[PDB]
Amino acid sequence: RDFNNLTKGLCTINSWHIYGKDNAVRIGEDSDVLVTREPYVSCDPDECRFYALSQGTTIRGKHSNGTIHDRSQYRALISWPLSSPPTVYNSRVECIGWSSTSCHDGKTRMSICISGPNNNASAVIWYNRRPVTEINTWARNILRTQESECVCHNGVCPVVFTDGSATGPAETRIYYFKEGKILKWEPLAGTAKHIEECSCYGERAEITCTCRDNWQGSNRPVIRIDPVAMTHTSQYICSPVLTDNPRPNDPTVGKCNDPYPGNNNNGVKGFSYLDGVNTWLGRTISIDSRSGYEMLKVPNALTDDKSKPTQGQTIVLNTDWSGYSGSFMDYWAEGECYRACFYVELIRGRPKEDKVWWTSNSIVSMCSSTEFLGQWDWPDGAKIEYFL
Amino acid sequence: RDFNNLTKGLCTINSWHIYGKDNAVRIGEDSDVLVTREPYVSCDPDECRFYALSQGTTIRGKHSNGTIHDRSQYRALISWPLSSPPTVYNSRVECIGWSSTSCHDGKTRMSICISGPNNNASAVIWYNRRPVTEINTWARNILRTQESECVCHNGVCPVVFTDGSATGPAETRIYYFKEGKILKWEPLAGTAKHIEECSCYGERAEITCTCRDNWQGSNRPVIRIDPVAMTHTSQYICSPVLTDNPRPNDPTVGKCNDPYPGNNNNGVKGFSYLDGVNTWLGRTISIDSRSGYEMLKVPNALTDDKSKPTQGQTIVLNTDWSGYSGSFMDYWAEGECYRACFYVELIRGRPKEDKVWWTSNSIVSMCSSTEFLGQWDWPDGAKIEYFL
Amino acid sequence: RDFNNLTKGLCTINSWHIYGKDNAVRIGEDSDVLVTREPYVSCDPDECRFYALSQGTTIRGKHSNGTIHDRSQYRALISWPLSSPPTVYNSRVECIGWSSTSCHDGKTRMSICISGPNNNASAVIWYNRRPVTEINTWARNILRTQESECVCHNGVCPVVFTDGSATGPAETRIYYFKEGKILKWEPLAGTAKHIEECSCYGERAEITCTCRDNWQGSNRPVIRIDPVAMTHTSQYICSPVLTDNPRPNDPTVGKCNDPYPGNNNNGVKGFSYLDGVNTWLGRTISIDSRSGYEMLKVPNALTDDKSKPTQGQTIVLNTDWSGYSGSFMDYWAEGECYRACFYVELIRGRPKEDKVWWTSNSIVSMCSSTEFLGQWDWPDGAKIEYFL
Amino acid sequence: RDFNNLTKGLCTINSWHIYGKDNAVRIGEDSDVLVTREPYVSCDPDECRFYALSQGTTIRGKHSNGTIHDRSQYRALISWPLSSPPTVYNSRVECIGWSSTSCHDGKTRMSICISGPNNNASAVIWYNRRPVTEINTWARNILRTQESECVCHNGVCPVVFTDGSATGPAETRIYYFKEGKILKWEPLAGTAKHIEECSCYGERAEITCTCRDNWQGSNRPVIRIDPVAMTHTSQYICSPVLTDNPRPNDPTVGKCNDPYPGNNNNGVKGFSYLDGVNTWLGRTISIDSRSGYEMLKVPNALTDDKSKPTQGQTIVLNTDWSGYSGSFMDYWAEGECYRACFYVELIRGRPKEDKVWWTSNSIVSMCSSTEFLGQWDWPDGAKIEYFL
Ligand SMILES: *[C@@H]1O[C@H](CO)[C@@H](O[C@@H]2O[C@H](CO)[C@@H](O[C@@H]3O[C@H](CO[C@H]4O[C@H](CO)[C@@H](O)[C@H](O)[C@@H]4O)[C@@H](O)[C@H](O[C@H]4O[C@H](CO)[C@@H](O)[C@H](O)[C@@H]4O[C@H]4O[C@H](CO)[C@@H](O)[C@H](O)[C@@H]4O[C@H]4O[C@H](CO)[C@@H](O)[C@H](O)[C@@H]4O)[C@@H]3O)[C@H](O)[C@H]2NC(C)=O)[C@H](O)[C@H]1NC(C)=O
Ligand SMILES: *[C@@H]1O[C@H](CO)[C@@H](O[C@@H]2O[C@H](CO)[C@@H](O[C@@H]3O[C@H](CO[C@H]4O[C@H](CO)[C@@H](O)[C@H](O)[C@@H]4O)[C@@H](O)[C@H](O[C@H]4O[C@H](CO)[C@@H](O)[C@H](O)[C@@H]4O[C@H]4O[C@H](CO)[C@@H](O)[C@H](O)[C@@H]4O[C@H]4O[C@H](CO)[C@@H](O)[C@H](O)[C@@H]4O)[C@@H]3O)[C@H](O)[C@H]2NC(C)=O)[C@H](O)[C@H]1NC(C)=O
Ligand SMILES: *[C@@H]1O[C@H](CO)[C@@H](O[C@@H]2O[C@H](CO)[C@@H](O[C@@H]3O[C@H](CO[C@H]4O[C@H](CO)[C@@H](O)[C@H](O)[C@@H]4O)[C@@H](O)[C@H](O[C@H]4O[C@H](CO)[C@@H](O)[C@H](O)[C@@H]4O[C@H]4O[C@H](CO)[C@@H](O)[C@H](O)[C@@H]4O[C@H]4O[C@H](CO)[C@@H](O)[C@H](O)[C@@H]4O)[C@@H]3O)[C@H](O)[C@H]2NC(C)=O)[C@H](O)[C@H]1NC(C)=O
Ligand SMILES: *[C@@H]1O[C@H](CO)[C@@H](O[C@@H]2O[C@H](CO)[C@@H](O[C@@H]3O[C@H](CO[C@H]4O[C@H](CO)[C@@H](O)[C@H](O)[C@@H]4O)[C@@H](O)[C@H](O[C@H]4O[C@H](CO)[C@@H](O)[C@H](O)[C@@H]4O[C@H]4O[C@H](CO)[C@@H](O)[C@H](O)[C@@H]4O[C@H]4O[C@H](CO)[C@@H](O)[C@H](O)[C@@H]4O)[C@@H]3O)[C@H](O)[C@H]2NC(C)=O)[C@H](O)[C@H]1NC(C)=O
Ligand SMILES: *[C@@H]1O[C@H](CO)[C@@H](O)[C@H](O)[C@H]1NC(C)=O
Ligand SMILES: *[C@@H]1O[C@H](CO)[C@@H](O)[C@H](O)[C@H]1NC(C)=O
Ligand SMILES: *[C@@H]1O[C@H](CO)[C@@H](O)[C@H](O)[C@H]1NC(C)=O
Ligand SMILES: *[C@@H]1O[C@H](CO)[C@@H](O)[C@H](O)[C@H]1NC(C)=O
Ligand SMILES: *[C@@H]1O[C@H](CO)[C@@H](O)[C@H](O)[C@H]1NC(C)=O
Ligand SMILES: *[C@@H]1O[C@H](CO)[C@@H](O)[C@H](O)[C@H]1NC(C)=O
Ligand SMILES: *[C@@H]1O[C@H](CO)[C@@H](O)[C@H](O)[C@H]1NC(C)=O
Ligand SMILES: *[C@@H]1O[C@H](CO)[C@@H](O)[C@H](O)[C@H]1NC(C)=O
Ligand SMILES: [Ca+2]
Ligand SMILES: [Ca+2]
Ligand SMILES: [Ca+2]
Ligand SMILES: [Ca+2]
């Protein structure tokens, strides 16, 4: 009932524990479950919820054929109860569009959807279930945003937007919103060459986003935002542990202010928790495809260009598919510190499972533990052959 | 918790932005979605909802065969959450009948359903979920009303009703209700010849309805109601930009107090926002059928008989079906002014898609923007061939 | 938040208007709708709801075969939102059993289910969602109760129970409950010979029940209960307009304290509103079967043995099936007087539609109007042939 | 809004009455009902709910094939409304795992799920919908817990956990939690040799659990916990009325501090209400398999090794399947004393109904009565042959 403020630091992450899992495509083989992709999680002061971009069809209905394509007029941002499947009967529609981000400021929720032709898109900013501000395309080539939650501090919620090429220079701007109104916006600054799909968190009055360079880095770019002064900077994560996909093998030394060369023009959304010695990175196991997922503790990843792993935990084995991953935390949980959390999208269907005509996914999510806990793997679990 | 009062004027409409879309018949190909028609939207102080007249069947159930017919004992007014499909499991029934209107007065909701044989129908007025007043047929030939929301000011909610022929003179009365009780009623006055299906809004303590002359105008009639003094007047929109369907081509000069001749005995429900220089009109693109939809800014449409378009925005392309359209606004949104909004029904099935035995529809809805935003088209999106 | 008291008299009933209709078996041809029978309606201070005894199956599931039988361990009292179908996903279970009654006292709800073998049944009295009192069989042959709502006055809610033969003398007791505890009980008194299935209402601190004599009256028995003094009396409705089914034709003179002879050992549950000149009776049109339904104004029916109809209204035409009917009113509606209401069960399936293996029903319900409104007929509306 | 305290003693149990029944597999033959096992019931201050471990599939979906296996990554603790089926659309997920226990302390709910490989499992303790404490495996062979509700007194909720062999000595610890944090833990003490699956209740500031010795007793072990002093003791129920399954026939004398020999290495979860002369025991009728269920009053069962039955009540007949059974009570019900209650799992599918490829169950539950009520039997009621 007053605005949240990032007062705490992160707890120490000694391992990760299961937080949510919806088993969507299993249950979707015989229930009215919606086809989705681009998932995230976001909390409110009294409940956390699962989020995604619908495709306007059930998995087993005939309009599922073709849902590999990303933008169209039938997609919408939807949220459902934690660890339930996105079902026709139990989902809330937030706004209409094919790209999105959402966060609670402590009083109410802000949600952003973007819709349009490639060359004439727009974003409209919803605050307390109502349309309030609208922005139109500035560079005229797919105005897109985070695909996971934003973070607010005392009313200001910064969002990163990118408009222009995915294959060369683009135009990225950080917008600072308070109650749906634009307070100010800046263009991208610092040394990062290209920004797409930022995964963000906040602690001790500072916001950290780990993003996706699609043009040329296999190492990830980092934007650090100050919500009071409303300024930002960018860098790349120095560590030679590379974390985009596809990517070349890991080198011995890495790069702090330049992209690491090797693959060009493709990527995946990812995250990291950058906190000195208490720094963990997530990545696909495969260097060629989005398959397998693992967490690795690389002390001082951001600042040391020779930093190797000290500890790890496998989340999805290499034989199963992963997809986008992103950060969230529950800033309304009781405690001295913020507990870190993430999610991994588990895509099933096309492109890799060519025997079906659709593309959908489930979620698995995880939070930290100060305890050193044993691990298990968390695969989607459907058998594609039942859908034939 | 006290009655709403129309205190504000309209914002300036420089373009329109997507507000809601339910993709009902797509999802209805494999979910328990109800067959409907005659949709509208209506807000409460804390949520806006989608509304329609059910047919008492799912799209894919066998009693869908025959739902082209308009009146029967299995239809009911239902409402569901914004941008969800009218599903068996998620709909609230408001009252039983085949014609309806509904509005919130700031304390609670008033809903009107009408049921009967053609020659012996009645309306019962529900207020705060209970039956309170009942009116019986006066001219004995299909007592019908708005098919979209009414508007209240300090407790008085005027509704327009028509009883009698659709093909010659009829008997139309404006009723003023306060808390479900009739304060007064008048017969239609001014110069409009025939009234059917009024789409209404209010601003600065005045209510404007744009209606449908079914007997002989291709230009639309306008009733202006004063909720304090409880009086009204009618006219036609002077502009030569004609907006009923079917209609002849646009002339050079139009008609303020007479119907424009050309087509006879048929029409569609429509709306306009009549606000001096800030006047927008909606219409089908086809002059022969309900296909395509577009918004056009015609400054001073109501009062100037030579007024041509200054700006426009295509909402549905000509190759896709449209249907009824109607006004709504959210009089409980924060702001200095009322933001204008509308919806378009997108009918699928019979008469035009003769290969199926049913008739159902989806909704797309839109609100204003002071920004000049790019456009996209918003078609239903189902493929009829999947239902064969 | 304090106990309701029957302060008002009835309004004048000049005609009846549609109140609720769920179209259950139509929508049940392709939705997860439960098989039911024995329906009623009952209001709470803030919403009215539909009630019935489930059979533990959907209409289209295979355990529907056999649901003609009345008692078994898979039946339960369930309630759902007004004018919705009894669906798997939207129903609340109240208590487990094959006979039931329920009423709100103004603070919370009392519900009674009965379960057992024929010779060893029991009733348990639920108050504010919890078990509180239990009664066991006294005459050891199907302990049964109202199958529609009870009525409370200042905390006392009388219920009529019958244990013993349906084909000769039985043992009927009126129990007076306050907050789930038994204050007192009496055996049946006055002149009525046999009591089954009472339909009750209250006005001006008195409760009236019209019941079913199954042994030998084609005229109905009436119990009048005083909730303060906790006493009762019985009589039969004097009028020669006979209202049980099956029944012989109407005579010229009727019987006040004896059953009218003609048919023996069978009946249907029914009701009447007995209020001097403002007295209305409901009945099947067919004298042989539960088909058609109509309301008839017979002034002074209770007390005059030569009273003929003055006005009427057809509710269901003779060509369609009806079933049980029962009274309810909304004692929390605003007004100077209690508005009368009823429901009719519309049974479909066996015995009469022998081509299917199941038995289920829908509801239509109606309330009074001081206006003289036109009528329509309200049939179930499913086509049995779609279920083959 | 303050912590519950066990202030009352038990009421006298003179018979048992139906409390809840969900008929899940009947309705599951044609609805989206989840496959489950290991059920229980647990109350909150304002509603009681049904609980179970999901398998991540509907009964009629193809991933039902194989659900006989107990642990996997697709299981979760779920709760639904009392006497409804575990449906996709109406279930709340509590935490992810294949073993669980849950209880309300009067302020909010505590829930524990366990997940892992056999040799590397962990438990995470949820309090007020959030992760708070995590424990890791101590003996490295299936860390498991109660499979029914825990009981709190003034904030302390003791839970029994077992880690190690089911076929020899294991390592069992009683943990005392207050608001999700561990106050203290002890290892098992007293004379019981092996503990698995405790069914617990509390009265007059003491908690009683009746558990399962899997290694070698056909008589059940009892742990008595003091929540203030945080200590416990164990014994076996002296009575010669044996209550595990499988078991040898009943002897003439039984054993208070040693297991009764006869069967080795297998069992079922069960309960008892141990209250001097007012002591009731539940058991399967079959000595070879989980089929039939009955309640028997054996005065002083715990303390007398020659105690025979005085009264009984059959709950499920021998020809039908039963499964796990467990205690619950509603410590927020109005009254002078705690009313005792239990549930029985009714397993259908494999191992015994080998003609289907799945394993699922329904619930029947019961509470006490001071009245001597007649009995009925409460079987699952599905016909397996409809699933072929
Ligand atoms: C019970 O549960 C517990 C708790 O989970 C289990 O204990 C955990 O076990 C894990 C598996 O052993 C272990 O995870 C590994 O940790 C290593 C860290 O240990 C090192 O440092 C510590 C401290 O100094 C020492 O104790 C230890 O000896 C080691 O020195 C990581 O090194 C591991 O990650 C690497 O291996 C995996 C595959 O095994 C790779 O997928 C991963 O990417 C890492 O390896 C690649 O990357 C590094 C860094 O660049 C390269 O140098 C290396 O060559 C690899 O490079 C190739 O591969 C990548 C991807 O394929 C590619 O991109 C690149 O180009 C190359 O091709 C791993 O994280 C946990 O730390 C441990 N936890 C605890 C608390 O102990 C226990 O086993 C369970 N079971 C039982 C029975 O108890
Ligand atoms: C990115 O997004 C932006 C934002 O949406 C896009 O920009 C918009 O582009 C629209 C399409 O060009 C444009 O809409 C048109 O606007 C015209 C208004 O412009 C005129 O006035 C302004 C100011 O003076 C001038 O700048 C301009 O030069 C023009 O003079 C309207 O005239 C257009 O409507 C008419 O055309 C459409 C078909 O194109 C018809 O369907 C419509 O009914 C109108 O035409 C009929 O009616 C008129 C009036 O009677 C007749 O005179 C005419 O002959 C037509 O009559 C026949 O047709 C009707 C129906 O079929 C029939 O009933 C009748 O009998 C006849 O048969 C149209 O509204 C937007 O204004 C513009 N917005 C902005 C902010 O700039 C941009 O393109 C996007 N794309 C890219 C790559 O950026
Ligand atoms: C528009 O809507 C309006 C509003 O609804 C419509 O107006 C209504 O029209 C109804 C149909 O005409 C009418 O209902 C009838 O009312 C009669 C009452 O009228 C009499 O009294 C008044 C006042 O004195 C006079 O004005 C009038 O002239 C009459 O004298 C009832 O008599 C009618 O009920 C009887 O007929 C129906 C069949 O038509 C039977 O089913 C019913 O059971 C009644 O008849 C049986 O029972 C009586 C009494 O015992 C017997 O005497 C008789 O012989 C019948 O007995 C056989 O049948 C029963 C059952 O089958 C069986 O058990 C028995 O043994 C025998 O076999 C009927 O109720 C409304 O009153 C009228 N309302 C108003 C406000 O005016 C209007 O039509 C609509 N349409 C249009 C175009 O406007
Ligand atoms: C209407 O409803 C009412 C209310 O429910 C019905 O009344 C109830 O009727 C029940 C059935 O008769 C009755 O239940 C039985 O109660 C016996 C207690 O009675 C004895 O003591 C009282 C007081 O002294 C006396 O009045 C009476 O004469 C008796 O002496 C129990 O003994 C019964 O349980 C035993 O029988 C059943 C089968 O019938 C077994 O399944 C059960 O396990 C018990 O028997 C086994 O165990 C005992 C103890 O070890 C052995 O000694 C015995 O040999 C059996 O052992 C074999 O079987 C077990 C399991 O198969 C196996 O493990 C073992 O190794 C051996 O193989 C039973 O509980 C209720 O008490 C009575 N209630 C009331 C209030 O009166 C009424 O009938 C209904 N119907 C009508 C028409 O009214
Ligand atoms: C956040 O900080 C502002 C002042 O900077 C203060 O008013 C507000 O109460 C703080 N937030 C909360 C949740 O206390
Ligand atoms: C999917 O669509 C393509 C054309 O877009 C068609 O060839 C294909 O057969 C469809 N798949 C199925 C299962 O119908
Ligand atoms: C509407 O006007 C009346 C007096 O005309 C006033 O009492 C009421 O409070 C006004 N409405 C609101 C929402 O303030
Ligand atoms: C629809 O109904 C007509 C008769 O009303 C029948 O001829 C037609 O075949 C039906 N359509 C279907 C698909 O059964
Ligand atoms: C009913 O009557 C009692 C006294 O007889 C009174 O306390 C109570 O308030 C009355 N009911 C209501 C709703 O006022
Ligand atoms: C219903 O059950 C009977 C036996 O009880 C059986 O003969 C009949 O064929 C069943 N009906 C259907 C449709 O299976
Ligand atoms: C439980 O006992 C504590 C003190 O031991 C007391 O504060 C608390 O209020 C008691 N519980 C309730 C529900 O009163
Ligand atoms: C279940 O799975 C087994 C192999 O795990 C397979 O042989 C069997 O046929 C399956 N059952 C069904 C009905 O498909
Ligand atoms: Ca890249
Ligand atoms: Ca016209
Ligand atoms: Ca009779
Ligand atoms: Ca054992």
Short mmCIF file of N, CA, C and O in Angstrom, two decimals, chain B residues 32 55-58 60-63 72-74 88-89 93 96 98 115-117 130-131 134 136, chain C residues 17-18 21 23 26 29-32 45 83 87 330 332-333 339 369 373-377 381 383 386:
data_model
loop_
_atom_site.label_atom_id
_atom_site.label_comp_id
_atom_site.label_asym_id
_atom_site.label_seq_id
_atom_site.Cartn_x
_atom_site.Cartn_y
_atom_site.Cartn_z
N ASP B 32 -14.97 -25.52 -24.44
CA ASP B 32 -16.39 -25.42 -24.28
C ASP B 32 -16.74 -23.99 -24.23
O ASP B 32 -16.91 -23.43 -23.15
N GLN B 55 -26.65 -18.57 -26.89
CA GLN B 55 -27.64 -19.35 -27.59
C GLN B 55 -27.95 -20.64 -26.85
O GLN B 55 -28.80 -21.40 -27.32
N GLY B 56 -27.30 -20.94 -25.72
CA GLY B 56 -27.58 -22.16 -24.97
C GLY B 56 -26.92 -23.40 -25.56
O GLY B 56 -27.53 -24.48 -25.54
N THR B 57 -25.70 -23.29 -26.11
CA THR B 57 -25.00 -24.42 -26.79
C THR B 57 -23.53 -24.07 -26.92
O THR B 57 -23.21 -22.87 -26.95
N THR B 58 -22.67 -25.08 -27.08
CA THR B 58 -21.29 -24.82 -27.43
C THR B 58 -21.18 -24.76 -28.95
O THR B 58 -22.07 -25.28 -29.62
N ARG B 60 -19.25 -26.52 -30.84
CA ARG B 60 -19.06 -27.82 -31.39
C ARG B 60 -20.08 -28.83 -30.91
O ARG B 60 -20.01 -30.01 -31.27
N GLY B 61 -21.09 -28.41 -30.15
CA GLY B 61 -22.12 -29.34 -29.75
C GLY B 61 -23.16 -29.39 -30.86
O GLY B 61 -23.31 -28.45 -31.64
N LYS B 62 -23.92 -30.44 -31.03
CA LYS B 62 -24.97 -30.50 -32.05
C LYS B 62 -26.12 -29.48 -31.92
O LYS B 62 -26.78 -29.24 -32.96
N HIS B 63 -26.42 -28.80 -30.79
CA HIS B 63 -27.56 -27.89 -30.85
C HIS B 63 -27.05 -26.57 -31.46
O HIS B 63 -27.82 -25.63 -31.56
N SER B 72 -35.65 -17.13 -29.10
CA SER B 72 -35.97 -18.49 -28.70
C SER B 72 -35.86 -18.46 -27.20
O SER B 72 -35.34 -17.52 -26.61
N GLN B 73 -36.30 -19.52 -26.53
CA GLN B 73 -36.24 -19.59 -25.07
C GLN B 73 -34.90 -19.99 -24.44
O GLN B 73 -34.76 -19.98 -23.21
N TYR B 74 -33.86 -20.33 -25.25
CA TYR B 74 -32.54 -20.80 -24.77
C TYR B 74 -31.44 -19.72 -24.74
O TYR B 74 -30.30 -20.04 -24.38
N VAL B 88 -18.41 -22.26 -21.02
CA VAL B 88 -19.47 -22.74 -20.12
C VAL B 88 -19.18 -22.51 -18.62
O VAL B 88 -20.04 -22.19 -17.79
N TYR B 89 -17.91 -22.70 -18.30
CA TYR B 89 -17.39 -22.69 -16.95
C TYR B 89 -17.07 -21.28 -16.45
O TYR B 89 -17.01 -21.06 -15.27
N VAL B 93 -24.54 -15.52 -15.69
CA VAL B 93 -25.79 -15.14 -16.34
C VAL B 93 -26.45 -13.97 -15.58
O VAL B 93 -26.55 -13.92 -14.36
N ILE B 96 -32.59 -13.61 -18.40
CA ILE B 96 -32.95 -14.51 -19.48
C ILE B 96 -33.63 -13.71 -20.58
O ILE B 96 -34.56 -13.00 -20.26
N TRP B 98 -33.77 -12.47 -25.25
CA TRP B 98 -33.16 -12.30 -26.55
C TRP B 98 -32.83 -10.89 -27.05
O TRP B 98 -32.54 -10.72 -28.25
N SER B 115 -37.99 -11.09 -23.21
CA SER B 115 -38.29 -12.42 -23.66
C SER B 115 -39.77 -12.40 -24.03
O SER B 115 -40.51 -11.51 -23.60
N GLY B 116 -40.18 -13.34 -24.86
CA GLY B 116 -41.56 -13.45 -25.27
C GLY B 116 -41.72 -13.99 -26.69
O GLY B 116 -40.75 -14.14 -27.45
N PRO B 117 -42.97 -14.31 -27.08
CA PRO B 117 -43.43 -14.31 -28.45
C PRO B 117 -43.33 -12.88 -28.97
O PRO B 117 -43.40 -11.85 -28.27
N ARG B 130 -31.22 -8.42 -8.66
CA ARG B 130 -32.57 -8.85 -8.32
C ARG B 130 -33.62 -8.33 -9.33
O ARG B 130 -33.46 -7.19 -9.78
N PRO B 131 -34.72 -9.01 -9.73
CA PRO B 131 -35.85 -8.40 -10.45
C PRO B 131 -36.50 -7.30 -9.67
O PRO B 131 -36.73 -7.54 -8.48
N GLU B 134 -40.96 -4.36 -14.39
CA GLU B 134 -41.32 -5.16 -15.55
C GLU B 134 -42.20 -4.25 -16.39
O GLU B 134 -43.04 -3.48 -15.89
N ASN B 136 -44.38 -4.33 -20.18
CA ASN B 136 -44.99 -5.24 -21.14
C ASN B 136 -45.06 -4.45 -22.45
O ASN B 136 -44.96 -3.22 -22.47
N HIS C 17 -43.04 -13.86 -14.20
CA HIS C 17 -42.05 -13.40 -15.17
C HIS C 17 -40.82 -14.34 -15.19
O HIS C 17 -40.54 -14.85 -14.11
N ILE C 18 -40.03 -14.70 -16.26
CA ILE C 18 -38.84 -15.58 -16.09
C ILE C 18 -37.82 -14.99 -15.12
O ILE C 18 -37.52 -13.79 -15.10
N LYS C 21 -33.14 -19.96 -15.69
CA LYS C 21 -33.30 -21.12 -16.57
C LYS C 21 -31.90 -21.57 -16.88
O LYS C 21 -31.12 -20.74 -17.31
N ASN C 23 -30.86 -24.44 -19.01
CA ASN C 23 -30.65 -25.15 -20.29
C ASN C 23 -29.58 -26.24 -20.16
O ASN C 23 -28.80 -26.59 -21.06
N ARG C 26 -29.00 -29.37 -22.81
CA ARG C 26 -28.62 -28.89 -24.15
C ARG C 26 -27.13 -28.74 -24.17
O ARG C 26 -26.43 -29.40 -24.94
N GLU C 29 -25.01 -31.85 -23.68
CA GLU C 29 -24.76 -32.77 -24.78
C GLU C 29 -23.29 -32.63 -25.10
O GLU C 29 -22.72 -33.56 -25.64
N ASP C 30 -22.57 -31.54 -24.79
CA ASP C 30 -21.15 -31.42 -25.14
C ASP C 30 -20.32 -30.61 -24.14
O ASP C 30 -19.45 -29.82 -24.51
N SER C 31 -20.52 -30.82 -22.84
CA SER C 31 -19.86 -30.14 -21.73
C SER C 31 -19.82 -31.03 -20.50
O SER C 31 -20.46 -32.10 -20.53
N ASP C 32 -19.09 -30.76 -19.42
CA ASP C 32 -19.06 -31.68 -18.33
C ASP C 32 -20.04 -31.25 -17.33
O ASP C 32 -19.69 -30.60 -16.35
N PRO C 45 -28.39 -14.04 1.93
CA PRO C 45 -28.57 -12.58 2.00
C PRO C 45 -27.99 -11.85 0.79
O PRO C 45 -28.49 -10.80 0.39
N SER C 83 -28.56 -19.81 -12.91
CA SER C 83 -28.77 -19.94 -14.35
C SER C 83 -27.63 -20.48 -15.23
O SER C 83 -27.67 -20.39 -16.48
N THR C 87 -22.18 -28.16 -13.46
CA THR C 87 -20.98 -28.61 -14.12
C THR C 87 -19.96 -29.23 -13.19
O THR C 87 -19.93 -28.84 -12.04
N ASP C 330 -37.08 -14.63 -2.00
CA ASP C 330 -35.88 -13.95 -1.55
C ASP C 330 -36.22 -12.98 -0.44
O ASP C 330 -36.53 -11.79 -0.63
N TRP C 332 -34.38 -11.40 1.42
CA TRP C 332 -33.42 -10.30 1.58
C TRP C 332 -33.56 -9.26 0.45
O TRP C 332 -32.74 -8.37 0.29
N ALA C 333 -34.59 -9.27 -0.40
CA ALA C 333 -34.78 -8.32 -1.48
C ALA C 333 -35.41 -7.08 -0.85
O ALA C 333 -36.11 -7.25 0.16
N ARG C 339 -41.90 -11.15 -2.67
CA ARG C 339 -42.30 -11.47 -4.03
C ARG C 339 -42.40 -12.98 -4.20
O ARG C 339 -41.38 -13.63 -4.01
N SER C 369 -45.37 -10.82 -10.62
CA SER C 369 -45.41 -9.47 -11.07
C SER C 369 -46.84 -8.98 -10.79
O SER C 369 -47.83 -9.72 -10.92
N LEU C 373 -48.37 -9.45 -17.35
CA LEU C 373 -47.43 -9.62 -18.45
C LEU C 373 -47.87 -10.74 -19.42
O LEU C 373 -48.55 -11.72 -19.02
N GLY C 374 -47.43 -10.66 -20.68
CA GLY C 374 -47.71 -11.72 -21.66
C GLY C 374 -46.92 -12.93 -21.25
O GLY C 374 -45.91 -12.80 -20.54
N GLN C 375 -47.37 -14.11 -21.64
CA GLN C 375 -46.69 -15.38 -21.40
C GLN C 375 -45.88 -15.98 -22.56
O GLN C 375 -46.12 -15.70 -23.74
N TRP C 376 -44.92 -16.86 -22.27
CA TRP C 376 -44.27 -17.67 -23.28
C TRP C 376 -44.16 -19.06 -22.66
O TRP C 376 -44.48 -19.21 -21.48
N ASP C 377 -43.79 -20.11 -23.41
CA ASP C 377 -43.56 -21.41 -22.81
C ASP C 377 -42.05 -21.65 -22.78
O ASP C 377 -41.26 -21.10 -23.56
N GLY C 381 -35.75 -28.06 -24.05
CA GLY C 381 -35.16 -27.72 -25.34
C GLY C 381 -34.11 -28.69 -25.90
O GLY C 381 -33.65 -28.44 -27.01
N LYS C 383 -32.75 -32.18 -27.81
CA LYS C 383 -33.29 -33.14 -28.75
C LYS C 383 -32.69 -34.47 -28.30
O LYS C 383 -31.50 -34.64 -28.54
N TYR C 386 -29.80 -36.44 -30.39
CA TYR C 386 -28.39 -36.10 -30.50
C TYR C 386 -27.56 -36.95 -29.54
O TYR C 386 -26.33 -36.90 -29.59
#
